[PDB]
Amino acid sequence: GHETAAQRYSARLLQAGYMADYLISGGTGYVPEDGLTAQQLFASADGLTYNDFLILPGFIDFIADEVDLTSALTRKITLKTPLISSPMDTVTEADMAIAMALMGGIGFIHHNCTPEFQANEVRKVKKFEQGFITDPTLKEANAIIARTDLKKNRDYPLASKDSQKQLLCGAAVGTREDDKYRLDLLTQAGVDVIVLDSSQGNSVYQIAMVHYIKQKYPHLQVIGGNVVTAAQAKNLIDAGVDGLRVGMGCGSICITQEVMACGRPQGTAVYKVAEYARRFGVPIIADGGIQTVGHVVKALALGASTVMMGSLLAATTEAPGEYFFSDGVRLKKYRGMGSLDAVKIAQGVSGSIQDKGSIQKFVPYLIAGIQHGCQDIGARSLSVLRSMMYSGELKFEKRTMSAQIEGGVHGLHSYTFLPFTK
Amino acid sequence: GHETAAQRYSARLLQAGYMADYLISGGTGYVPEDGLTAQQLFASADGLTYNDFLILPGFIDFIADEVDLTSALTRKITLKTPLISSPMDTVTEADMAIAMALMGGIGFIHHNCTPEFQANEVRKVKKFEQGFITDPTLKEANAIIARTDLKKNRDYPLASKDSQKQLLCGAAVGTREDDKYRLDLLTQAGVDVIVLDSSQGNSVYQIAMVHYIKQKYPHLQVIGGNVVTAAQAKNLIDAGVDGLRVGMGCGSICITQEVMACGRPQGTAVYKVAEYARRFGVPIIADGGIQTVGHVVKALALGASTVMMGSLLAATTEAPGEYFFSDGVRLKKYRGMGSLDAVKIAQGVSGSIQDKGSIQKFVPYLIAGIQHGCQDIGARSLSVLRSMMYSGELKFEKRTMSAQIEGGVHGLHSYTFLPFTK
Amino acid sequence: GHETAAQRYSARLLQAGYMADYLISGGTGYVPEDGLTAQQLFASADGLTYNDFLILPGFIDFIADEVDLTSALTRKITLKTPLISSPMDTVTEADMAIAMALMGGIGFIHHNCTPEFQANEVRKVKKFEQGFITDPTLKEANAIIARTDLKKNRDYPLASKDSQKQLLCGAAVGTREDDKYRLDLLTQAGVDVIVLDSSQGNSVYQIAMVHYIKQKYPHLQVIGGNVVTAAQAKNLIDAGVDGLRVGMGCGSICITQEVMACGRPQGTAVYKVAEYARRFGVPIIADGGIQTVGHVVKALALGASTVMMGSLLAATTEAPGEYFFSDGVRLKKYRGMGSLDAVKIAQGVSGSIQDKGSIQKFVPYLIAGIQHGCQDIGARSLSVLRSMMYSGELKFEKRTMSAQIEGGVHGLHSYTFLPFTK
Numbered sequence A, B, C: 001g002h003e004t005a006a007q008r009y010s011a012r013l014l015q016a017g018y019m020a021d022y023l024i025s026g027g028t029g030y031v032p033e034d035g036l037t038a039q040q041l042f043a044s045a046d047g048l049t050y051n052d053f054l055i056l057p058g059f060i061d062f063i064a065d066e067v068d069l070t071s072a073l074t075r076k077i078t079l080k081t082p083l084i085s086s087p088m089d090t091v092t093e094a095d096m097a098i099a100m101a102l103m104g105g106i107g108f109i110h111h112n113c114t115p116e117f118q119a120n121e122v123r124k125v126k127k128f129e130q131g132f133i134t135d136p137t138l139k140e141a142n143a144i145i146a147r148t149d150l151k152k153n154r155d156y157p158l159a160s161k162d163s164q165k166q167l168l169c170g171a172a173v174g175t176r177e178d179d180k181y182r183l184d185l186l187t188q189a190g191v192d193v194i195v196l197d198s199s200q201g202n203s204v205y206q207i208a209m210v211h212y213i214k215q216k217y218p219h220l221q222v223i224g225g226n227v228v229t230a231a232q233a234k235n236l237i238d239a240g241v242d243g244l245r246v247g248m249g250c251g252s253i254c255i256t257q258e259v260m261a262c263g264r265p266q267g268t269a270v271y272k273v274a275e276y277a278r279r280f281g282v283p284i285i286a287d288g289g290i291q292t293v294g295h296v297v298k299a300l301a302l303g304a305s306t307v308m309m310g311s312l313l314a315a316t317t318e319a320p321g322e323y324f325f326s327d328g329v330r331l332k333k334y335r336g337m338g339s340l341d342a343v344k345i346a347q348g349v350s351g352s353i354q355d356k357g358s359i360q361k362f363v364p365y366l367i368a369g370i371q372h373g374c375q376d377i378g379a380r381s382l383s384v385l386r387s388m389m390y391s392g393e394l395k396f397e398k399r400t401m402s403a404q405i406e407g408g409v410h411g412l413h414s415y416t417f418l419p420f421t422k
């Protein structure tokens, strides 16, 4: 079980020079109560997003580099990094999925393509790094073996690998009858995990699909389609999903709230669905609305096990399509899967995003920002962070609008922002 | 009464393979409580508009195309679509009224014109589609009969018709003595329903008019002029109106709040007047402030039986007047009936709206968006939607300002929005 | 720090036969929230006594006999039992003080007597069990040594002893100038600890006395005379007391509330003064209003380190004075120190109490009742109990009057109560 700020502070005073105190409170230790708990924070029933609150700083007794980012993707899959690339056709094909797996996250390949194309993109990921090449003890390396996989293994210390030392790959499927043929090809191609990709996952079509998959492929991991209430999470956990995607109407390319009136503010949705799903041991993906490393840290602190990004990974070099320069700045398209670009009504807008270079120079920046966020909180790992949140030890503070203005840049005439140097 | 999400989910699990549970709860089923009810939502006494809240998603066991939109306009008139065109001189004359009646709603012809002109515009609507042409068993189709009316029937399966197979038409009148002569001509022209068109309907002039109409034309339907409180709704329901228009100071061309200090935020007004009016079996029109299909779904979920649009139908081809290209885009004028364009003080601003093409290519888009909004809620019809709201099954969530920013488009460089493809 | 119910339950499931769960919550474990915390309980600002609330049951993974009752009397004195006999002339002289010291608590000898008499009663306690009799390695047991003290050791394994193997004794003094000579005699007699014994301890007279004692006898332990607010506790902790007595106007012989309007309900007083005093490492004595072993457990759970009894120890055989049979039942007198039996106004009533036999057959009953109360809470010690209270793990429930009626004996015709059999 996790150690409280007072316990750590006492052990560190005790390692050094600088009875009734133990007998009185028995190692709980007086700390002045300040801020709110997640429970109090969300009792008000305002609709909070990530911008509406702050996390209060804690006690530091470690450096940032030693923060453990190990996360559950599902009941059975673990990642060394909490980051996931979204199953969108402007975000995740084999190159993005390979890159995310190498940096210790995972990518879900999109399904706005033919079944044979998606299965080939999955096979490209599973082929990229190899133990024994059986279709040309594994300790014999230092069927075929090649030193290039030892170089990959050296160069990428966090890489998400299966038992055969191949990269992990996810894929999307819908809830239509012809998705049964996709899933046959994807399970032949060696896919590790599935997302069912509904905008609203609490449906007979999705529940029938979850029961069909758990019957035909009982070793396959399945993640529930998008939910934002505990009542939706109940029926998918009772259908036997191994994880959930959380978020509806948030996400930068989205218009579903203004078209359909359904959705939820993403902070409350992540907190409420995670606080329900933990009772059954089910991990949460927080999906959409992630603009900054502070949104990743907030999503994780509210109980998300992993964070899924669309826009923040769009216009990296590994994202699908090509750059086009049109506005006098280097731009790549980013479309939304319910745009009419991707009666039928649009659920999303098709747009464009400025260039960010490679995933491999940008994900270690998100990792470093998550570690430094966890260090100022006093969390030695992400499991310790969620543990402190559920126990009340972690404190929160609501923001007014003037407070959010004050949390940005003020009356400078001009400024330059450089986020990271190397 | 309607069936609950747990009842529907249980029947669906029961149609298939996948005792104490029934004996304990009597089939109610456990659903984790999440969100607010309309009652809790409006207990806070903040002034909520449609932008200030969301509807939480439900349980889906049907496709969107089978959502029933049948609505009550008054105690005795039913429409197959909840949409009404507003009685403004830049919105509703015979062409708009014909188009709305044909797509399954109704139009109220404006009164900023002579009594003889308004009666001629009403007669143009009542003539457009005919059964027995008596002024050149009806199943004789397959005293004159024309096949063009059979074609009209074939092409418009939701047309709002009277017993004689003619389109429904509404008209406006004021509460002056000379409005008694208008109403003689309009009832000779065959008008089906009246609106009394006040800014503030709770007046002796209006109550005297409602009593005069119900005395002279006892078969005529009358809709009360604008109200925003239950105390105003009481005196008009007691005078014997068959419906109410709800909204004061909202509506895109309006300035009444800044000029007069009177009004109400339209969400609260629709909820509070509809909650009162249902006790007497009186339908509500939600009038003004409708910018999106999500505003229509929200207005209907709060208890409105029908929704009346000005701006959203302005600059369609059937809207009065001509296009004029002035700002480098095709524009039509949209004036507000208390603008000085239409001491005398302005209640509204005269302005301009961009072209949208025909009502007949734009109303099936609003219908499709209402159906998809009701599908994500779990409502098989609009009646079921309002039933779930009054019974607490439907849940709501308030939005902060950062939450409404998150419900729009985020840090895209640029975006294109196409609302519908066909 | 203490281990939580979820942590203990998980280790006990783990010792036996009957991953994402650890990665999600960091071992905190889901437990459904129920009841109130001490903080919430006292936020209401009602005046709660011990009868107004209950402690909610926890998780058991130990037997009662292994509950540790070790307690702090002051910053430097520890007792193996949390029970103290009150400094009243119908309760504590040498025989009661010897008996309490032998069963593992302590007695404070009363000051309603000459200084020489009080010093002789203190000397009688310090003489009773001896190590080296120097006024006729100590491992020499197996300058005089007697086997009777070895037998005393054998028979009383919880006796409160000093370094010289003598029983601990406390004494009372007032805050008058003539108490300076009294305290010189008590420190010659070998007293271990002092109580300053006031109705209202927050006075210049008591603060001047605390400063005088800490100057002249810097190794002597001093407990501050009675307080019921954090503002009173501040000035005595700042004067340098080593403990506080908490309670004003409670206590069975008391009338101070009806005479003076001052006091506090004893539950709130114990909670609020203990919550303040823990910030400085100062133990609390809960003083008066103890009628049942459940009052002792409640006082200790609210943050009291020890509990002081008057009435519950009155009319034991070791209590001062002689028995009488005036009402057919066997009785002793029990007087209150501000009664006029003990213009001047009474603060207390002089009365009578029924016989209970010896301290040595009645204190092991209070010990067994405290252990069984801590077992149902799931507290392995009193330190762990207070730790669970300050950390929110321990839950409370308020009682209505009908609830208190239901917590007693109901519609029986008659009943017999035997509290303990051996």
Ligand SMILES: NC(=O)c1ccc[n+]([C@@H]2O[C@H](COP(=O)([O-])OP(=O)(O)OC[C@H]3O[C@@H](n4cnc5c(N)ncnc54)[C@H](O)[C@@H]3O)[C@@H](O)[C@H]2O)c1
Binding pocket: A174, A175, A176, A177, A197, A198, A199, A200, A203, A205, A206, A226, A247, A248, A249, A250, A251, A254, A256, A336, A337, A338, A347, B060, B062, B063, B064, B375
């Ligand atoms: N998370 C969001 O906020 C959000 C919102 C809108 C769209 N999207 C994305 O856009 C894409 C499309 O989402 P979607 O929800 O429109 O796809 P969808 O296929 O789940 O839903 C489209 C329609 O088809 C229906 N449907 C689904 N399976 C069916 C079946 N077997 N039989 C009959 N009807 C069936 C649905 O109920 C719905 O009316 C996905 O990539 C999704 O992630 C996401």
Ligand SMILES: NC(=O)c1ccc[n+]([C@@H]2O[C@H](COP(=O)([O-])OP(=O)(O)OC[C@H]3O[C@@H](n4cnc5c(N)ncnc54)[C@H](O)[C@@H]3O)[C@@H](O)[C@H]2O)c1
Binding pocket: B174, B175, B176, B177, B197, B198, B199, B200, B203, B205, B206, B226, B247, B248, B249, B250, B251, B254, B256, B336, B337, B338, B347
């Ligand atoms: N819903 C709104 O928020 C809103 C606000 C302002 C105007 N409007 C619209 O503008 C138009 C004008 O509305 P209006 O209310 O100003 O017109 P109105 O003629 O009803 O009211 C104008 C004034 O005349 C008075 N009046 C009405 N009947 C009278 C009678 N018989 N004898 C004496 N005085 C009488 C009214 O009390 C008011 O002082 C309408 O189309 C209306 O729908 C709407």
Ligand SMILES: NC(=O)c1ccc[n+]([C@@H]2O[C@H](COP(=O)([O-])OP(=O)(O)OC[C@H]3O[C@@H](n4cnc5c(N)ncnc54)[C@H](O)[C@@H]3O)[C@@H](O)[C@H]2O)c1
Binding pocket: C174, C175, C176, C177, C197, C198, C199, C200, C203, C205, C206, C226, C247, C248, C249, C250, C251, C254, C256, C336, C337, C338, C347
């Ligand atoms: N805890 C209670 O609820 C409570 C209430 C009343 C009495 N008592 C008990 O009864 C006994 C008497 O208590 P008490 O408070 O009346 O005794 P006390 O001597 O402390 O107070 C009596 C009066 O003398 C004053 N006084 C004290 N020291 C003084 C000094 N040096 N110079 C001048 N004035 C001084 C006090 O302020 C008060 O007015 C004690 O045993 C006490 O514990 C307890």
Ligand SMILES: Nc1nc2c(ncn2[C@@H]2O[C@H](COP(=O)(O)OP(=O)(O)OP(=O)(O)O)[C@@H](O)[C@H]2O)c(=O)[nH]1
Binding pocket: A127, A128, A129, A130, A133, A135, A136, A146, A147, A148, A149, A152
């Ligand atoms: N040789 C080989 N490599 C494979 C195959 N499938 C996957 N790989 C991967 O290909 C990667 C590249 O290895 P290299 O050492 O660069 O192979 P190479 O030098 O290009 O081999 P040549 O094609 O013979 O020139 C390794 O990480 C292998 O795991 C396969 O069928 N054959």
Ligand SMILES: Nc1nc2c(ncn2[C@@H]2O[C@H](COP(=O)(O)OP(=O)(O)OP(=O)(O)O)[C@@H](O)[C@H]2O)c(=O)[nH]1
Binding pocket: A129, A130, A131, A132, A138, A139, A141, A145, A146, A149, A150, A152, A153, A154, A156, A157, A158, A159, A161, A165, A166
């Ligand atoms: N042939 C081959 N050997 C590998 C590969 N990955 C790891 N190994 C070897 O198998 C052993 C695995 O230990 P690690 O490399 O520490 O852990 P890992 O999880 O397998 O891989 P990394 O996450 O890349 O460190 C080492 O001897 C590796 O060199 C791979 O892709 N191909």
Ligand SMILES: Nc1nc2c(ncn2[C@@H]2O[C@H](COP(=O)(O)OP(=O)(O)OP(=O)(O)O)[C@@H](O)[C@H]2O)c(=O)[nH]1
Binding pocket: B127, B128, B129, B130, B131, B133, B135, B136, B146, B147, B148, B149, B152
């Ligand atoms: N013929 C006729 N049609 C009417 C009259 N009043 C309304 N209508 C409508 O006119 C519509 C058009 O019918 P068409 O078949 O196009 O009539 P048409 O071919 O223009 O008739 P002609 O004028 O003889 O050329 C039908 O939907 C009728 O309901 C009327 O007095 N006479």
Ligand SMILES: Nc1nc2c(ncn2[C@@H]2O[C@H](COP(=O)(O)OP(=O)(O)OP(=O)(O)O)[C@@H](O)[C@H]2O)c(=O)[nH]1
Binding pocket: B129, B130, B131, B132, B138, B139, B141, B145, B146, B149, B150, B152, B153, B154, B156, B157, B158, B159, B161, B165
């Ligand atoms: N001459 C004529 N016959 C009609 C008209 N509308 C309906 N009918 C006929 O009268 C019957 C009505 O059929 P329906 O279409 O099912 O009922 P409806 O609601 O009036 O019309 P729809 O909206 O088209 O469904 C049918 O026998 C039609 O042929 C009309 O406008 N003109």
Ligand SMILES: Nc1nc2c(ncn2[C@@H]2O[C@H](COP(=O)(O)OP(=O)(O)OP(=O)(O)O)[C@@H](O)[C@H]2O)c(=O)[nH]1
Binding pocket: C127, C128, C129, C130, C131, C133, C135, C136, C146, C147, C148, C149, C152
């Ligand atoms: N011998 C002795 N024992 C003392 C003295 N003060 C206290 N005691 C206690 O008295 C007890 C000794 O009891 P006994 O051995 O029976 O001595 P006694 O009570 O004097 O009985 P007799 O010797 O028979 O008169 C021990 O517990 C001592 O601690 C003292 O001055 N002398």
Ligand SMILES: Nc1nc2c(ncn2[C@@H]2O[C@H](COP(=O)(O)OP(=O)(O)OP(=O)(O)O)[C@@H](O)[C@H]2O)c(=O)[nH]1
Binding pocket: C129, C130, C131, C132, C138, C139, C141, C145, C146, C149, C150, C152, C153, C154, C156, C157, C158, C159, C161, C165
């Ligand atoms: N002569 C004498 N020896 C004692 C006395 N009390 C303890 N001792 C001795 O000193 C040691 C105390 O051991 P313990 O009995 O375990 O601990 P304690 O706190 O002193 O006393 P207990 O409560 O009996 O445990 C032992 O070696 C005893 O023999 C006493 O009262 N008189």
Ligand SMILES: O=c1[nH]cnc2c1ncn2[C@@H]1O[C@H](COP(=O)(O)O)[C@@H](O)[C@H]1O
Binding pocket: A086, A087, A088, A247, A249, A250, A251, A252, A253, A254, A255, A256, A287, A288, A289, A290, A308, A309, A310, A311, A312, A336, A337, A338, A339, A347, A348, A349
């Ligand atoms: O058309 C759409 N409408 C609504 N949400 C979408 C659509 N397409 C994708 N999404 C969601 O948007 C998320 C990306 O959000 P972003 O990272 O903030 O840009 C994805 O992971 C999907 O869950």
Ligand SMILES: O=c1[nH]cnc2c1ncn2[C@@H]1O[C@H](COP(=O)(O)O)[C@@H](O)[C@H]1O
Binding pocket: B086, B087, B088, B247, B249, B250, B251, B252, B253, B254, B255, B256, B287, B288, B289, B290, B308, B309, B310, B311, B312, B336, B337, B338, B339, B347, B348, B349
């Ligand atoms: O001059 C005016 N001032 C205030 N409200 C008006 C005026 N003229 C019309 N309205 C209202 O505005 C509604 C249209 O609102 P809109 O659809 O949001 O533009 C109409 O249906 C009337 O109820």
Ligand SMILES: O=c1[nH]cnc2c1ncn2[C@@H]1O[C@H](COP(=O)(O)O)[C@@H](O)[C@H]1O
Binding pocket: C086, C087, C088, C247, C249, C250, C251, C252, C253, C254, C255, C256, C287, C288, C289, C290, C308, C309, C310, C311, C312, C336, C337, C338, C339, C347, C348, C349
């Ligand atoms: O005369 C008095 N008036 C008020 N309180 C008293 C008086 N004498 C003693 N006390 C307090 O009463 C406590 C005993 O309470 P009891 O055990 O409930 O009877 C003592 O420990 C004192 O703190």
